[PDB]
Amino acid sequence: APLKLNSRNLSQIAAAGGALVKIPTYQRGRAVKEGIVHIGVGGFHRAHLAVYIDQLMQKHGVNDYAICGVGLQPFDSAMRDALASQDHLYTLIERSAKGSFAHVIGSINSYLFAPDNREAVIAKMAHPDTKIVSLTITESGYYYNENTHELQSEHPDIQFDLDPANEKAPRTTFGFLYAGLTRRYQQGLKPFTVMSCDNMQKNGSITRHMLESFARLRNPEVAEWIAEEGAFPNAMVDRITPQTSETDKTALAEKFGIVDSWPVVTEPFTQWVIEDQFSDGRPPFEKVGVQVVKDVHAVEQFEKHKLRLLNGSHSALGYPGQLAGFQYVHEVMANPLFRKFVWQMMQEEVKPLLPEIPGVDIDEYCNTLIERFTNPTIMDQLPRICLNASGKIPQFIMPSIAEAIWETGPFRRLCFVAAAWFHYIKGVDDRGKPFEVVDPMREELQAKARAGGNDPSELLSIKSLFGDDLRNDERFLREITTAMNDIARDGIMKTLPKYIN
């Protein structure tokens, strides 16, 4: 019979799990020191950072960087209950075409539910054992005005945490970080590194600016100390981690004999690039496949690879795939015409625009991306890929076109993708079936798309989305006009051969 995941059942779980299960054999509890305090224990932390730490503990005997997880909101009580009932063990389920495999993760050693005791969280962060405070709080948790690049200090949440009456009861990430750092300053300790693991560009620089700005509104002396002695490394993170369903839980018990209140499902691939900026020490991340780099310029190089080849290929699969009648990313990627289209867009048009990175083979990366896209267990819905395209195409596809214009390099397939979005905006696929177009600019986009025919001039006139270099290039206009005409007349599948070889 299946067994509840916990310390006392771990050995029998391993004994009955065959080659389908692996378990931590390092010691836990009092045997480790919690060098990492993680704010926002969710799926991505439990599939990415926590797994690197697990491998450092298991394969290399690192004993002082176990994780104390923190949940900030009442909603997080379910995570507290799941981990507490399992002695903070949980199962990572890796799924691919090869099948599914269970990896019990033991790197989270304890959990602090902030609404139960906010002082405990501050004191934990302030404790000398804490070397790193890591974050997965999503973009909205940064209280970041992207237009002005400033802290939203007028936000009621920030005003509350800034009130000295609340200095012992912060509620935001920055309130907790500041309260912890002020106590470290009092104790003569170094600032802990603040290590943002959210998937956003300049995650470290944004975190630094927000906390510095917060601290400046409290005590400028502490703020200067944070600025000068603190560490806020920028990083690139990549690992697909879908939400767990109730069926994932019952499937785990049925196949692997593990009863887990909240397992985590993920893909085999994982990547972590992080610049070497740490204020209170770090474990040897490089030993478990982490790419530790020099500075933010080095991180930006990896981020450009991912933006143009991963997200750019998602665009190639998404809008053409929706028009063609597909439902899932893995269906589009398995189609032979799309396989050649995407690979040749990657190789002929995107790759020449990319910086070479020591130890990185772009052709290997391209093949890995296609393999990940083909993974049928991800069940990545094309409507989710295509959602809010006005914020995606100008970031993933148009920059490659613009840089191709600067050197008169190849961009026919890139233009095809942009033209496929333009046709997609009308909301009718190649079989005559409507689909929803979801976009913060949906009304304007559908207005312009109707004004223009099979012609892109009206859409390209939106000055907030497209620059003058696009409208003033004759080869681009001629190329996207042609693609948009052929897609409208013959559809995606019939037009793809004109872009292969």
Residues contributing to the annotated binding site: 36-47
Cβ-based neighbour number of residue 154 at 10 Å: 9
For residue 435, give the amino acid letter: F
Closest CA to 380 of 310, 434, 285, 442: 310
3-state SS, one letter per residue, for 89-148: CEEEEEEECCEEEEEEECCEEEEEEHHHCHHHHHHHHHCCCCCEEEECCCHHHHCEECCC
* Residue 206 main-chain phi, psi, to 5 deg: -65, -45
Please, which residues have CB within 8 angstroms of residue 15's CB and are 6 or more apart in sequence?
none
Could you give the CA distance from residue 194 to residue 309 in angstroms, rounded to a whole number?
29
| Buried-exposed string 28-65: b where 16+ CB fall within 10 A, e elsewhere | beeebbbbbbbbbbbbbbbbbbbbbbbbbbbeeebeeb
Q: Which residues contact 43 (CB under 8 A, 6 or more apart)?
A: 241, 242, 243, 244, 264, 266
Q: Point out the annotated binding site for NAD(+).
A: 36-47
Contact 479, 415 (CB under 8 A): yes
Q: Which amino acid does the sequence have at 166?
A: N
Please state the φ and ψ torsions of residue 17, each to the nearest 5 degrees.
Answer: -90, -5
Is residue 40 within 8 A of residue 135, CB to CB? The reply is: yes
